[PDB]
Amino acid sequence: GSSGSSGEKPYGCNECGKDFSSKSYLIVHQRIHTGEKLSGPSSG
Numbered sequence: 097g098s099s100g101s102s103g104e105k106p107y108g109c110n111e112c113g114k115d116f117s118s119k120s121y122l123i124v125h126q127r128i129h130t131g132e133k134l135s136g137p138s139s140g
C-alpha cells in the first residue's frame with residue numbers, strides 16, 4: 097500500500113560526490129566545477 101513513487105534525491109554529483117533533491121540544485125552546483133580552461137601559467 098503506497099500512494100505512488102517515493103523518489104528521493106535521485107540526482108547526484110559524481111565530480112565531487114554531492115546529493116541534491118532536484119535536477120536544478122545539481123546543475124547549478126556542477127557549475128562550480130566546469131569553467132577550467134587550459135590556458136594558464138602552469139601549462140605543464
Ligand SMILES: [Zn+2]
Nearest residue numbers: 109111112113
Ligand atoms: Zn560536485
